[PDB]
């Protein structure tokens, strides 16, 4: 049942993610928005699952948390279907330019 | 067998597929004969010289269009990095695992390479870069036994 499973590597930028949202989800520049939030005490952008908010945990009232739904990365469409129905993360690396 | 066409599959009507027969690579003539009669691919890497801008990755795959061996005769090699790469994350030989295409006689067969989401009229993420990419370089390593 184990076949060699072809590896794909795909960068995703969050700036493009948040900007590309439909209007209802409140797309937003990431830089401006972030800088506003750190500048002030609180606030968010974004839809319910794509938002950039401050944290509600006991620790982390200050920690800024920026959350990205996958369903809006539409990674399933960066290839044909039928090439492989199961598609599963090998790992995630983060670059914070 | 050498054509560059669009794909006829249900998915991949848009994916641009560019197929190269080996029999026209005449790899058997880049050495004497009698040095080794059996000549067989160790692996294939693909370089897609092009301007792929940060942050963007090329998307393509390499089928093989004939019956050889390996796994169901179906082993893709998914070109993403775009520079001198193979379908493996961290490539290594002597790993215990066959590399994809290892074992293909270098005459028989057909080698195809498919960029998904190519065709512009039906909007496509790779149309732009595929306009920009100059040409495809394939690095074949074939051990002469």
């Amino acid at each position: 049942r184990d076949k060699r499973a072809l590896e794909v590597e795909r960068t995703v930028s969050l700036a493009e993610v948040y900007a590309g949202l439909p209007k209802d989800n409140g797309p937003f520049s990431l830089a401006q928005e972030i800088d506003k939030l750190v500048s002030q005490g609180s606030g968010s952008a974004g839809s319910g699952n794509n938002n950039l908010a401050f944290g509600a945990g006991t620790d982390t009232k200050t920690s800024l948390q920026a959350s990205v739904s996958f369903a809006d990365l539409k990674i399933r469409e960066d290839y044909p279907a039928s090439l492989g129905k199961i598609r599963r993360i090998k790992q995630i690396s983060v670059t914070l330019p | 067998n050498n054509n560059l066409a669009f794909g006829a599959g249900t998915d991949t009507k848009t994916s641009l597929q560019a197929s190269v027969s080996f029999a026209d690579l005449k790899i058997r003539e880049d050495y004497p004969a009698s040095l080794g009669k059996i000549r067989r691919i160790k692996q294939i890497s693909v370089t897609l010289p092009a301007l792929l801008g940060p942050y963007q990755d090329v998307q393509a795959i390499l089928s093989y269009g004939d019956k050889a061996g390996l796994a169901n005769g179906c082993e893709a090699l998914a070109v993403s990095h775009g520079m001198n790469d193979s379908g493996q994350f961290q490539l290594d030989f002597n790993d215990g695992k066959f590399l994809p295409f290892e074992g293909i006689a270098i005459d028989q067969g057909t080698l195809t390479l498919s960029f998904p989401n190519a065709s512009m009229p039906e909007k496509g993420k790779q149309a732009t870069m595929l306009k920009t990419l100059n040409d495809i370089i394939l690095h074949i390593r074939y051990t002469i036994k």
Partner: protein
């Protein structure tokens, strides 16, 4: 009585609102008020011995104020009351209703969210506590707000 309409199965309500509706109804069940606005206006108006004395619409208007550091009509509603000058104008919870409502109707969507946030939270606090001290049937031992949950 719940409706199985698709509308009920999709649109995502902030909870602590559904609850707040439950509590307004459980309150209106007793004393037979003319509308919910009579329950928040009335109960939330003068209800001593606990935080219940706090008024809802006062919170909705003070939340508009929360909205800005400091149409002129709405300004005649907020100047219509007198928080910083002339003590408290004592406008009726009716004029509170139009005042806060008007002041919000011209307010942004995200800030409308956060005002539902703070508003719904506090309103839950008061409606909870009042539902504790009264309207909670003495048959069920009720006591703390959790045992209310």
């Amino acid at each position: 009585s719940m409706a199985l309409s698709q509308q009920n199965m999709d649109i995502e309500l902030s909870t602590l609102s559904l609850s707040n509706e439950l509590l307004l109804e459980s309150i209106k069940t007793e004393s037979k008020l003319e509308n919910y606005t009579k329950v928040m206006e009335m109960l939330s108006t003068f209800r001593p011995s606990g935080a219940t004395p706090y008024h809802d619409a006062y919170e909705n208007v003070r939340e508009v104020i929360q909205l800005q550091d400091p149409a002129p009509q709405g300004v005649s509603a907020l100047v219509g009351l007198d928080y910083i000058q002339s003590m408290k104008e004592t406008p009726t919870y009716a004029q509170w209703e139009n005042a806060a409502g008007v002041l919000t109707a011209g307010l942004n969507s995200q800030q409308a969210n956060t005002l539902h946030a703070f508003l719904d939270e506090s309103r839950s606090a008061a409606l909870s506590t009042y539902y504790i001290r009264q309207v909670a049937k003495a048959a069920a031992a009720i006591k703390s707000r959790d045992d209310l949950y």
